[PDB]
C-alpha cells in the first residue's frame, strides 16, 4: 500500500490536474460518481495508489486542489469528473496572485498555506505507507509557481524523508500570458533545484508545436495542450498504477534516474501522436523511432544537443516483448554518441499490457538529458533581458522582495546550466 | 550500422582496416572506452577479454585470440612443441631449442649442455643462437660458455636453439634470408593463408667463419636497413616477393616454390594452429575472435623448411597492405557483420 | 587414476578419483557503526531543518 | 542429525527460496499441507530430510527457513501461495518500505531497525536444533535489501553463531534480467562487508540463467519463474547431499573443506547439465560422459567465463540419477585427454564425486524435462575472477564521476566506505591473479 498524495495548484495546475484524474479514472474504471465499473482486477490491484476507498465501494482521488482565486476550481467542480473530488480538498482564496510569484509565495499565498497543509496532513495520516507527493503546476504564473513552491518547502519541512515530484509547465514567449513569466519561472526553478527529487519539464512551446505541426491543429487551445499532458502523465505513472514485475516505488525510481541531486529535471515524451489515418496499427519499430524523435518530446529541447544521463521507457499494449528489446537496443547501439558512457546500462524499458484508452499500444519516454540546459538558457536569457533594466520589478518589490533575491535566482540557474554543460563533455 | 573501437594506435595493419571500415560508410568509430561496440581492435598487452560478450543485444568481435600467446612467445612456443602430443619433441621442422632461465631467478640448462657435449664430441657443427622476446639482443656463438653467460647478464627468460649453419643462399650474392607468411584465422577457425608472402633477405654475403658480425646472419628488416652496407642492392628494401623467388627456384633448382617450400609452410601452419584450437576456439564462446599471424620460416640447402617463430602482432609489407587489409575486412570482419574474386587467401582445410 | 574412499548406501554412493598427486567485529563495534551512520543522518537532517527555518 | 536454517533476504532470495522449497517438497514427497506419508515417525525423527524440515505433533513437516524482506509484496505471495500451509507466520518477516536499491538504506537506515527482530526469529529456529550446522543465505547483489541488509545479517550471525558455517547463494547482476544502474555499487559494497563472514558462496549470474533459458528451454523472454526454477535445480543439486543419505558434502563445513583452500577465494563456479526443454517431443537421454563433458562447456556455467584460461583449486562432481562409478571414471579419463584443465601446483589434480540414485525432480508443468541423469560440477577456478573484473569496471566508471553517491551518503554512509570496499575488490582481484597467472 504505497500511497501517493496528489496536489494541483493554480489555473494551469488544476486544469492539467483535472484532465489527469479524468484520464486515469477512465483507465481504472472509476466513473464520474466514484463507483468502479471496470472489467479486470488489474484495474483495482494498485488502485489505492491514487484513490481512497470510501463506504459503499466508492473511490475518491487522493487529490488536493489549491488556488488563490475561485474561478478555475469552480470549473473543475462543475467539470466532467468534478463530482469525484473530496469536497474538503478544495482550498482556495479570493484575492488571486496576479501572475505574481511574490504574491503566491510571500503574501497572498502565505495567508492560505496552513489550511492546505492541514489537508495534506489529513490525507497523509490515512496512508498505510506514503510513497511521496506529486504536484502539477505552471512556473510562469503566480499561484502554481509562487505558492506551489512554498507548499513544496513546507511539505519538505514536515515530511523531510518523503519523495517530492512535480509536473512543471515551463513558460514560453510563443505561448505566454504575461511578460513577467521569465521572472516567475527563474524564481521557481531555484526552489525546485533544492526541494524536488524529480521534475518533469513540460514546455508550453513544445506542446504548441506538436499540436500545430504533428497533430495538424490550425489553432491549438489550452485544452489541446492539456490533452497531451494528461496522456504523458498517465504514461509516466503507468508503472505505479498497474501490476508488473517492476516492484518500484518513487524512491527506487528516483535513486536510479538521478545521478546528481540537482540534475533531476526530466524530458517527457509520448508516442504515438497521430492526426485524424488514425486507426492504423503502429509497429514496435514505429513506436521506438517516434518516442525517441525530438518532435515527440515536450521540453522543446533537441536531445542531439546533449547526452542522456539516464533513460526510461514504458511500453503499453500487447506487443512482442522480444521485439521491444530489439528496437530499444537498436536505438542505443545506433546513437551511442548521445548517451554517457560512464553509467553502464543507463537505458531501462518496461512493458504494461493495459494500453491507454483508444490506443492499441503506446510508448512514454522519460529522459534525464543534459540538453535540458537549453530550456534554462532560454529562461535565463529572457530573465536577464528584463532584469538588466529592472523592467516590471516594481510588481515584486511592492510585495516586499529585494533585488538581491533576483540576483541570486539568476546565479543559481546559470550555475545549473554550467553544471549540465560539464557533464555533457 | 556497425560500430567499432580502436585500442592499439600503433597497428599499421588495423589502422588500414579501420580506414577501410569507415570508407564503407557502414561502420562507425567510437571512443576506445565505449563498451557498446561490435568490433574491438584491441591492445597488444592485457586485452580485457573478460569484458567481451556481456552487452545485451550486441555481437562483439575482437582481433585477438585469447591464448594465442602460447604460440607467439619464444619460450612458450618451445614448451608447447615439447609438451604437445600433436607436435611431440621429435618435431621435424622446429630447430632443437631449450628454455634457459638466468641464474638470478622449469629450466633446461643441464639438458641443453647434454646435447651440446654430444655435438662437440661428435665433430658436428655446434653453433647456437640465443634470443629472448625482450629483444629489439641476440647472440650467435659456437661456445656454450658464451651463450649461458650472455643470458645471466640479462634478467629475462631466454631460449637457446640450434643455428641453421646450412641456410639456402640466394645467388648471386651468397646471402641468407627468411620467409614471412601472413595467416588469418576467422571466428569459425578457418585457416586462411595469404597468397602473398615476402622474403626478408640479407644484403650481405653469408660468412660462416665470423658470427661476430650479425648483419649477414640476422635477416631482420631493421638490422639489414641499419647496419648492412648493401641495403637495397639486389631487391628493393631487402624484400623479394614470391613471383620473383619462384622464378629463381625454377631457373636455379629446377623446382617450384609450391612443391619445394610451400607444402611444408602450409603443413607447419596447420600443425601449430590445429594444436591449440581446443584451447582458444571461440565457437562456443560469448564473443568471437579472429587474428592475423606472422609466421617466420627458414630454408636450408636441402630445401627443408624450418619454423623460427610466430608473431601475434605482425606488420605487413608496404606493397601488400591494401590487399591483405581488405582481405581481413572481407573474410574476418564482414563475414560476421555483412555490408549492404578469386580469393587472396588459401584456405588450409582441416578437421575441427 | 586411482579411486579411494568408496562409500555405498541404498540411495547412492560417493568416491574420490586422484589423477595426479600435488606439487570479527564484536556486537558493540557493529552497534557503533549502525549508530554512527544514524548520527550522520541526524546531523544532515538538522542542517536541512535549520536551512528551512532560515 | 544436524540442522540447516535457510535465510532468504530480499525479493530475489525470497522468490528463489520459494522455488527451492517447492522442489524440496516434491523431492521428499511432502504435500503442500505439510503432511508426509512416508515419514513413519510422526512428530519426530532424525532422518536426512530433518536437516531442512522440523515436525509438528500433528505430522506437519515445516521448513527450517526465515523469509526477510523490507517490503511486504513479495512475501505476501508466499503467505497466500500454494505452500502457505508450510510456514507459520513468525517465519515470514516483512517491513513497510524497501531499500530503494540503496545499499546504505538496507544496511544502516532500515537494517538497524529490524535486525534484532530477524535475529530473534532465527534464534527460534535455532532453539529447535540439537546440533545446528549453519545457515544458507539467499540474496541478490543488486537489491538494496539483498545487498545491504544481508551484509548486516552476516555480521551479526558471526557474532551470535561464531562456530557455525555460513553459505551464500548470491544473484550476480546482469542487464538482461531486470537490473538497475546502481547495482554495481551495491554488489561491491556487500561483497566487501560480507567477505570475512561467508565460508562459501555460489554466485549465479542472471545473464547465464537467461541464456540457458533462451538457448535450451527455447524461451523467447524468460520470466523470474523460469529463471528461479532453473536456479533451484542447481541449488537442489548443491544441497541434496545435506538432505539425502550420502557421504560427500554431508555437512556445511565439508563445503569449505572440499572447495575453498584459501578463505577469501570462496566462490566456486557451478556448472549444470543437462537442461532439456520439456516442450521437446522426445530428447535422446545423454550419457555420463556427455553430461560430464558438458560441465566443461562455458554454455552451461552459472557464471559466464572461460575456465580454459584459469587454474582449478578444487572440483566436485555431483550426479543424480542412473549413474555408476564406472561410467564417471571412464568419462573423466576421456576429458583429461581433451579439455584444458590446468590445476594449481599446490592442489591435487583430483575430483570428489557424489552419486545420488534418485534422478532430478522437475516441477510438473515446468519448463525442465525429466532426465534420467544429470550432474552439477562445483569447481573453484581463477576464471571466475572475470566476473569481479567486469563488475569492478562498472563500479569504476560511475565512481569516477561520483554518480549516485549522494543517495548513499544521504542515508548515513560515509563516502570513504566506497573506496575502502573498492580497494578490497582490488586486493581480491590480485589474489586470483597470484593463484592463476604465472
Ligand atoms: N534470478 C533472479 N533474480 C532476481 C529475482 N528477483 C530480483 N532479482 C534480481 O535482483 C536484483 C534486484 O534486487 P532485488 O532482490 O529485487 O531487491 P531487494 O533485495 O528486494 O532490495 P530492495 O532494493 O529493497 O527492493 C536485480 O538484478 C534482479 O535481476 C528473482 O526472482 N530471480
Ligand atoms: N636457429 C636459427 N638459425 C638460423 N637463423 C636464425 C635462427 N634463429 C634466428 N635466426 C635469424 O634471426 C632472424 C629472426 O630473429 P627472431 O625472429 O628470433 O627475432 P625477432 O622476433 O625480434 C625478428 P621478427 O619477430 O620481426 O621476425 C632471422 O632472419 C634469422 O635469419
Ligand atoms: N499547458 C497549459 N499551460 C497553461 C494553462 N493555463 C496557463 N498555462 C501557462 O501557465 C502560465 C500561467 O500561469 P497560471 O497557471 O495561469 O498562473 P496561476 O493560476 O497563478 O498559478 C503561462 O505560462 C501559461 O502559458 C493550461 O491550461 N495548460
Ligand atoms: C516515474 C517513473 N520513473 N522511472 C520509471 N521507470 C523505471 C524503468 C522502467 C520503466 C518505468 S516510471
Ligand atoms: C527497478 C528499477 N526502477 N528504475 C530503474 N531504472 C530507471 C532507468 C535507469 C536505470 C534504472 S530499474
Ligand atoms: Ca489578506
Ligand atoms: Ca520423522
Ligand atoms: Ca565466521
Ligand atoms: Mg492564469
Ligand atoms: Mg619476435
Ligand atoms: Mg524489494
C-alpha distances (whole Å) from D18 to each of D15, D60, D65, D136 are 5, 18, 10, 14
d(CA B348, CA B345): 9
| Phi–psi pair at D389, nearest 5 degrees | -60, -55
Is the domain of A250 the same as that of A273? no
Pick from A355, A371, A387: which residue ends a domain? A371
Residues D181, A325: C-beta atoms closer than 8 Å: no
Looking at CATH, the fold of the domain delimited by B2-68 is given as Rossmann fold (3.40.50)
Task: Report chain B residues whose CB lies below 8 A from the CB of D390.
Answer: 50-51, 54
d(CA A227, CA A223): 6
Elucidation technique: X-ray
C-alpha distances (whole Å) from D124 to each of C52, D83, D117, D165, D240 are 47, 21, 11, 18, 25
Query: Three-state secondary structure along chain A?
Result: CCEEEEEEEHHHHHHHHHHHHHHHHHHHCECCCCEECCCCCHHHHCHHHCEEEECCCEEEECEEEEECCCHHHHHHHCCCCHHHCCHHHEEECCCCCCCCHHHHHCCHHHHHHHHHHHHHHHHHHCCCCEEEEEEEEECCCCHHHHHHHHHHHHHHHHCCCCEEEEEEEECCHHHCCCCCHHHHHHHHHHHHHHHCCEEEEEEHHHHHHHHHHHCCCCCCCHHHHHHHHHHHHHHHCHHHHCCCCCCCCHHHHHHHHCCCCCCCEEEEEEECCCCCCCCCCCCHHHHHHHHCCHHHECCCCCHHHCCEEEEEEEEEECCCHHHHHHHHHHHHCCCHHHECCCCCCCEEEEEECCCCCCCCEEEEEEEEEHHHHHHHHHHHHHHHHHHCCCCCCHHHHCCCCCHHHHHHHHHHHHHHHHHHHHHHC
CB A49 within 8 A of CB A72: no
Q: How many residues does chain C have?
A: 54
**Helix C27-53 / helix D111-126 crossing angle, nearest 10 deg:** 150
CB B199 within 8 A of CB B178: yes
d(CA A246, CA A350): 8
Beta strands B39-41 and B61-62, pairing class: parallel
- Burial grade of B283 (CB within 10 A; 0-12, 13-18, 19 or more): exposed
Is the domain of D42 the same as that of D151? yes
Task: Report chain C residues whose CB lies below 8 A from the CB of A160.
Answer: 45, 48-49
Which three-class secondary structure state does DSSP give residue D374? strand
Residue D145 is assigned to a ligand binding site: yes
Is the domain of A230 the same as that of A270? no
CA–centroid distance for B139 within its chain: 20
Best to test chain B binding among D308, D392, D436 (most B CBs inside 10 Å): D308
d(CA D398, CA D386): 19
Is the domain of A244 the same as that of A255? yes
Which strand (E) or helix (H) includes residue D389? helix D385-399
Which strand (E) or helix (H) includes residue B31? none
From the CA of A312, give the closest atom in ligand 5: 8
- Residue B347 CB coordination number (10 Å): 11
D76 touching chain A per CB within 8 A: no
* Domains of chain A: total: 3
User: Facing residues of A303 across strands?
Assistant: none
Is the domain of D178 the same as that of D319? no
Is the domain of A323 the same as that of A203? no
- For a ligand 1 pocket test, name from D93, D141, D142, D153 the mutation site with the most ligand atoms within 8 angstroms of its C-beta: D142
All cell numbers assigned to D304: 559466464
A333: nearest CB among B31, B33, B57: B57
Q: Is the peptide bond before B129 cis (omega within 30 degrees of 0)?
A: no
d(CA D298, CA B71): 23
C-alpha distances (whole Å) from B27 to each of B3, B20, B39 are 6, 9, 10
Residues A333, B3: C-beta atoms closer than 8 Å: yes
In the block, cell 633446461 appears at: B108
Residue closest to D105 by CA, chosen among D92, D117, D114, D93 = D114
CB A154 within 8 A of CB A117: yes
Is the domain of A293 the same as that of A251? no
A325 touching chain B per CB within 8 A: yes
Is the domain of D275 the same as that of D351? yes
Q: List all residues 6 or more positions away from A250 whose beta carbon is below 8 Å from its beta carbon.
A: A2, A4, A131, A132, A163, A165, A197, A198, A240
In the block, cell 550471525 appears at: D157
Is the domain of D84 the same as that of D108? yes
Q: Which ligand is nearest to the CA of A204?
A: 3
CA–centroid distance for A8 within its chain: 11
Host domain of residue D257: 1-268
Is the domain of D258 the same as that of D213? yes
Residue closest to D386 by CA, chosen among D241, D200, D209, D205 = D205
Q: Is the CB of B298 under 6 A from ligand 2?
A: yes
Task: Indicate the resolution in Å.
Answer: 2.4
Q: What residue ranges line ligand 4, CB within 6 angstroms?
A: A 236, 239, 253, 257, 312, 314, 348, 350, 366
Which three-class secondary structure state does DSSP give residue D28? coil
Residues D176, B278: C-beta atoms closer than 8 Å: no
| Phi–psi pair at D375, nearest 5 degrees | -140, 145
Residue D51 is assigned to a ligand binding site: no
* Domains of chain D: total: 3
- Residue A274 CB coordination number (10 Å): 15
User: Facing residues of D204 across strands?
Assistant: D171
CB A104 within 8 A of CB A142: yes
Asked whether the CA dihedral B23, B25, B31, B36 is positive or negative, the reply is: negative
Residue D144 is assigned to a ligand binding site: yes
Is the domain of A153 the same as that of A100? yes
CB A152 within 8 A of CB A195: yes
B279: nearest CB among D175, D299, D308: D308
- Burial grade of A377 (CB within 10 A; 0-12, 13-18, 19 or more): middle
A255: nearest CB among D11, D221, D407: D407
Q: List all residues 6 or more positions away from B151 whose beta carbon is below 8 Å from its beta carbon.
A: B100, B101, B102, B130, B132, B158, B160
Q: List all residues 6 or more positions away from D140 whose beta carbon is below 8 Å from its beta carbon.
A: D10, D11, D12, D13, D146, D147, D170, D171, D173
d(CA D157, CA A355): 48
Query: Three-state secondary structure along B240-307?
Result: EEHHHHHHHHHHHCCCCHHHHHHHHHHHHHHHHHHHHHHHHCCCCCCCEECEEEEEEEEEECCCCEEE
Is the domain of A340 the same as that of A385? no
Residue A11 is assigned to a ligand binding site: yes
Residue closest to D199 by CA, chosen among D234, D125, D249 = D249
Residue closest to B47 by CA, chosen among B28, B64, B70, B72 = B64
Asked whether the CA dihedral A120, A125, A126, A127 is positive or negative, the reply is: positive
Pick from D383, D403, D418: which residue ends a domain? D383
Is the domain of D391 the same as that of D262? no
Q: Is the CB of A348 under 6 A from ligand 5?
A: yes
Residue closest to D115 by CA, chosen among A60, C35, B235 = C35
Is the domain of A220 the same as that of A89? yes
Interface of A with D in 323-342 (CB under 8 A): 325, 341-342
Is the domain of A9 the same as that of A153? yes
Subunits in contact with chain C (3 or more CB pairs closer than 8 Å) = A, D
Is the domain of A119 the same as that of A210? yes
Q: Is the CB of D144 under 6 A from ligand 1?
A: yes
Host domain of residue A309: 260-371
Which strand (E) or helix (H) includes residue D16? helix D10-27
Residues C48, A153: C-beta atoms closer than 8 Å: no
Residue D178 is assigned to a ligand binding site: no
Residues B51, D390: C-beta atoms closer than 8 Å: yes
Residues of D classed as catalytic: 254
Is the domain of A120 the same as that of A240? yes
Q: The CATH number of B69-70+168-348 is which of 3.30.470.20, 3.30.450.40, 3.30.300.30, 3.60.21.10?
A: 3.30.470.20
Q: Where are the beta strands (DSSP E) in D260-345?
A: 269-273, 312-321
Structural domain spans, chain B: 2-68, 69-70+168-348
Q: Which residues of D279-294 are buried (b: 16+ CB within 10 A; e: fewer)?
A: eeeeeeebebbebbbb
- For a ligand 1 pocket test, name from A247, A249, A344 the mutation site with the most ligand atoms within 8 angstroms of its C-beta: A247
Is the domain of D234 the same as that of D97? yes
Is the domain of D350 the same as that of D406? no
d(CA B120, CA B143): 9
Is the domain of A254 the same as that of A122? yes
Ligand 6 centroid to A93 CA: how many Å? Answer: 9
All cell numbers assigned to D210: 537467461
Q: What residue ranges line ligand 3, CB within 6 angstroms?
A: A 10-12, 15-16, 97, 99, 138, 140-145, 169, 171, 175, 177, 181, 204, 207, 222, 225-226
**Helix A321-332 / helix A284-291 crossing angle, nearest 10 deg:** 40
Strand order in the sheet with B158-162: B97-100, B158-162, B128-131, B139-141
Amino acid at each position: 500500500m504505497r500511497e501517493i498524495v496528489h496536489i494541483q495548484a493554480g489555473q494551469c495546475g488544476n486544469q492539467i490536474g483535472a484532465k489527469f484524474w479524468e484520464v486515469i479514472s477512465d483507465e481504472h474504471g472509476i466513473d464520474p460518481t466514484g463507483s468502479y465499473h471496470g472489467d479486470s482486477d488489474l484495474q483495482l490491484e494498485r488502485i489505492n495508489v491514487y484513490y481512497n476507498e470510501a463506504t459503499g465501494n466508492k473511490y475518491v482521488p487522493r487529490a488536493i486542489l489549491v488556488d488563490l482565486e475561485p474561478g478555475t476550481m469552480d470549473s473543475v467542480r462543475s467539470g466532467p469528473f468534478g463530482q469525484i473530488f473530496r469536497p474538503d480538498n478544495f482550498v482556495f482564496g479570493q484575492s488571486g496572485a496576479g501572475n505574481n510569484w511574490a504574491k503566491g509565495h510571500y503574501t497572498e499565498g502565505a495567508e492560505l498555506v496552513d489550511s492546505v497543509l492541514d489537508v495534506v496532513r489529513k490525507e497523509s495520516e490515512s496512508c498505510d505507507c506514503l510513497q511521496g507527493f506529486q504536484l502539477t503546476h505552471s512556473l510562469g504564473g503566480g499561484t502554481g509557481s509562487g505558492m506551489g513552491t512554498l507548499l513544496i518547502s513546507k511539505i519538505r519541512e514536515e515530511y523531510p524523508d518523503r519523495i517530492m515530484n512535480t509536473f512543471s509547465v515551463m513558460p514560453s514567449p510563443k505561448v505566454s500570458d504575461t511578460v513577467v513569466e521569465p521572472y516567475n519561472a527563474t524564481l521557481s526553478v531555484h526552489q525546485l533545484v533544492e526541494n524536488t527529487d524529480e521534475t518533469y519539464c513540460i514546455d508550453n512551446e513544445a506542446l504548441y508545436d506538436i499540436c500545430f505541426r504533428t497533430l495538424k491543429l490550425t489553432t491549438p487551445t489550452y485544452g489541446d495542450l492539456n490533452h497531451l499532458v494528461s496522456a504523458t502523465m498517465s504514461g509516466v505513472t503507468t508503472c505505479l498504477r498497474f501490476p508488473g514485475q517492476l516492484n518500484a516505488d518513487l524512491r527506487k525510481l528516483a535513486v536510479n534516474m538521478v545521478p546528481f541531486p540537482r540534475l533531476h529535471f526530466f524530458m517527457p515524451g509520448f508516442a504515438p501522436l497521430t492526426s485524424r489515418q488514425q486507426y492504423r496499427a503502429l509497429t514496435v519499430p514505429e513506436l521506438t523511432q517516434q518516442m525517441f524523435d525530438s518532435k515527440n518530446m515536450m521540453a522543446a529541447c533537441d536531445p542531439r544537443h546533449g547526452r542522456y544521463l539516464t533513460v526510461a521507457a514504458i511500453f503499453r499494449g500487447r506487443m512482442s516483448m522480444k521485439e521491444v528489446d530489439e528496437q530499444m537496443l537498436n536505438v542505443q547501439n545506433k546513437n551511442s554518441s548521445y548517451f554517457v558512457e560512464w553509467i553502464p546500462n543507463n537505458v531501462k524499458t518496461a512493458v504494461c499490457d493495459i494500453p491507454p484508452r483508444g490506443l492499441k499500444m503506446s510508448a512514454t519516454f522519460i529522459g534525464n538529458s543534459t540538453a535540458i540546459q537549453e530550456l534554462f538558457k532560454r529562461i535565463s536569457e529572457q530573465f536577464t533581458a528584463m532584469f538588466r533594466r529592472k523592467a516590471f520589478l516594481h510588481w515584486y518589490t511592492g510585495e516586499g522582495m529585494d533585488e538581491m533575491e533576483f540576483t541570486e535566482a539568476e546565479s543559481n540557474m546559470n550555475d545549473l546550466v554550467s553544471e549540465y554543460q560539464q557533464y555533457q563533455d | 550500422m556497425y560500430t567499432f573501437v580502436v585500442r592499439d594506435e600503433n597497428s599499421s595493419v588495423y589502422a588500414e582496416v579501420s580506414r577501410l571500415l569507415l570508407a564503407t560508410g557502414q561502420w562507425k568509430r567510437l571512443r576506445k572506452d565505449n563498451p557498446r561496440f561490435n568490433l574491438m581492435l584491441g591492445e597488444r598487452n592485457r586485452l580485457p577479454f573478460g569484458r567481451l560478450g556481456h552487452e545485451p543485444g550486441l555481437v562483439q568481435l575482437v582481433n585477438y585470440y585469447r591464448g594465442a600467446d602460447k604460440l607467439c612467445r619464444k619460450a612458450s612456443l618451445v614448451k608447447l612443441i615439447k609438451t604437445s602430443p600433436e607436435l611431440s619433441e621429435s618435431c621435424t621442422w622446429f630447430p632443437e631449442s631449450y628454455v634457459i632461465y638466468p641464474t638470478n631467478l622449469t629450466d633446461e640448462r643441464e639438458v641443453f649442455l647434454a646435447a651440446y657435449n654430444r655435438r662437440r664430441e661428435g665433430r658436428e657443427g655446434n653453433v647456437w643462437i640465443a634470443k629472448s622476446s625482450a629483444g629489439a639482443g641476440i647472440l650467435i656463438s659456437s661456445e656454450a660458455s658464451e651463450l649461458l653467460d650472455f643470458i645471466d647478464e640479462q634478467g629475462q627468460v631466454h631460449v637457446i636453439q640450434k643455428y641453421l649453419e646450412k641456410p639456402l643462399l640466394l645467388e648471386p650474392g651468397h646471402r641468407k634470408f627468411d620467409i614471412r607468411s601472413w595467416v588469418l584465422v576467422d571466428h569459425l577457425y578457418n585457416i586462411y593463408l595469404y597468397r602473398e608472402g615476402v622474403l626478408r633477405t640479407s644484403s650481405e654475403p653469408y660468412n660462416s667463419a665470423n658470427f661476430q658480425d650479425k648483419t649477414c646472419h640476422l635477416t631482420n628488416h631493421c638490422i639489414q636497413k641499419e647496419y648492412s652496407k648493401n641495403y637495397g642492392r639486389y631487391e628493393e628494401g631487402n624484400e623479394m616477393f614470391f613471383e620473383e623467388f619462384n622464378q629463381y627456384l625454377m631457373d636455379a633448382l629446377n623446382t617450384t616454390l609450391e612443391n619445394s617450400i610451400l607444402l611444408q609452410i602450409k603443413h607447419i601452419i596447420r600443425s601449430c594452429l590445429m594444436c591449440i584450437e581446443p584451447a582458444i576456439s571461440t565457437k562456443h564462446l560469448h564473443y568471437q575472435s579472429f587474428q592475423l599471424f606472422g609466421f617466420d620460416f627458414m630454408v636450408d640447402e636441402e630445401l627443408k623448411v624450418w619454423l623460427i617463430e610466430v608473431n601475434g602482432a605482425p606488420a605487413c609489407a608496404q606493397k601488400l597492405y591494401a590487399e591483405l587489409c581488405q582481405g581481413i575486412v572481407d573474410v574476418a570482419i564482414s563475414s560476421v557483420f555483412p555490408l549492404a574474386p578469386t580469393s587472396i587467401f588459401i584456405k588450409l582445410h582441416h578437421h575441427h | 587414476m586411482e579411486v579411494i574412499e568408496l562409500n555405498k548406501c541404498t540411495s547412492g554412493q560417493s568416491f574420490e578419483v586422484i589423477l595426479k598427486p600435488p606439487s570479527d567485529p564484536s556486537l558493540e563495534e557493529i552497534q557503533k557503526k549502525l549508530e554512527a551512520a544514524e548520527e550522520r543522518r541526524k546531523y544532515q537532517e538538522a542542517e536541512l531543518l535549520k536551512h528551512l527555518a532560515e | 542429525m544436524r540442522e540447516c536454517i535457510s535465510i532468504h533476504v530480499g525479493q530475489a532470495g525470497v522468490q528463489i527460496g520459494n522455488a527451492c522449497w517447492e522442489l524440496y517438497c516434491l523431492e521428499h514427497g511432502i504435500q503442500p499441507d505439510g503432511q508426509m506419508p512416508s515419514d513413519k515417525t510422526i512428530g519426530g525423527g532424525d532422518d536426512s530430510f530433518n536437516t531442512f524440515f522440523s515436525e509438528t505433533g500433528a505430522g506437519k513437516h515445516v521448513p527450517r527457513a526465515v523469509f526477510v524482506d523490507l517490503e511486504p509484496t513479495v512475501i505476501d505471495e508466499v503467505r497466500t501461495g500454494t505452500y502457505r500451509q508450510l510456514f507459520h507466520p513468525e517465519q515470514l518477516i516483512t517491513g513497510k518500505e524497501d531499500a530503494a536499491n540503496n545499499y546504505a538504506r538496507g544496511h544502516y537506515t532500515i537494517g538497524k531497525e529490524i535486525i534484532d527482530l530477524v535475529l530473534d526469529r532465527i534464534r527460534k529456529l535455532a532453539d529447535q536444533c540439537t546440533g545446528l550446522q549453519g545457515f544458507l543465505v539467499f540474496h541478490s547483489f543488486g537489491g538494496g535489501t539483498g545487498s545491504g541488509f544481508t551484509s548486516l545479517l552476516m555480521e551479526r550471525l558471526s557474532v551470535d553463531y561464531g562456530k557455525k558455517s555460513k553459505l551464500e547463494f548470491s544473484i550476480y547482476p546482469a542487464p538482461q534480467v531486470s537490473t538497475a544502474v546502481v547495482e554495481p555499487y551495491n554488489s561491491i559494497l556487500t561483497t566487501h562487508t560480507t567477505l570475512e563472514h561467508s565460508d562459501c558462496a555460489f554466485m549465479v549470474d542472471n545473464e547465464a540463467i537467461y541464456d540457458i533459458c533462451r538457448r535450451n528451454l527455447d524461451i523467447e523472454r524468460p520470466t523470474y519463474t523460469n529463471l528461479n526454477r532453473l536456479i533451484s535445480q542447481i541449488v537442489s543439486s548443491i544441497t541434496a547431499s545435506l538432505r539425502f543419505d550420502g557421504a560427500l558434502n554431508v555437512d556445511l563445513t565439508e563445503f569449505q573443506t572440499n572447495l575453498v583452500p584459501y578463505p577469501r577465494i570462496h566462490f566456486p563456479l557451478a556448472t549444470y547439465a543437462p537442461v532439456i526443454s520439456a516442450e521437446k517431443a522426445y530428447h535422446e537421454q545423454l550419457s555420463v560422459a556427455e553430461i560430464t563433458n558438458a560441465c566443461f562447456e562455458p554454455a552451461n556455467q552459472m557464471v559466464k567465463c572461460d575456465p580454459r584460461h584459469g587454474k582449478y583449486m578444487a572440483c566436485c562432481l555431483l550426479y543424480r540419477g542412473d549413474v555408476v562409478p564406472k561410467d564417471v571414471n571412464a568419462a573423466i579419463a576421456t576429458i583429461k585427454t581433451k579439455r584444458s584443465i590446468q590445476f594449481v601446483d599446490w592442489c591435487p589434480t583430483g575430483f570428489k564425486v557424489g552419486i545420488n540414485y534418485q534422478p532430478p525432480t522437475v516441477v510438473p508443468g515446468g519448463d525442465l524435462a525429466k532426465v534420467q541423469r544429470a550432474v552439477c560440477m562445483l569447481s573453484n577456478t581463477t576464471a571466475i575472477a572475470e566476473a569481479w573484473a567486469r563488475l569492478d569496471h562498472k563500479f569504476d566508471l560511475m565512481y569516477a564521476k561520483r554518480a549516485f553517491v549522494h543517495w548513499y551518503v544521504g542515508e548515513g554512509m560515509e563516502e570513504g566506505e566506497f573506496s575502502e570496499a573498492r580497494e578490497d575488490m582490488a586486493a581480491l582481484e590480485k589474489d586470483y591473479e597470484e593463484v592463476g597467472v604465472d
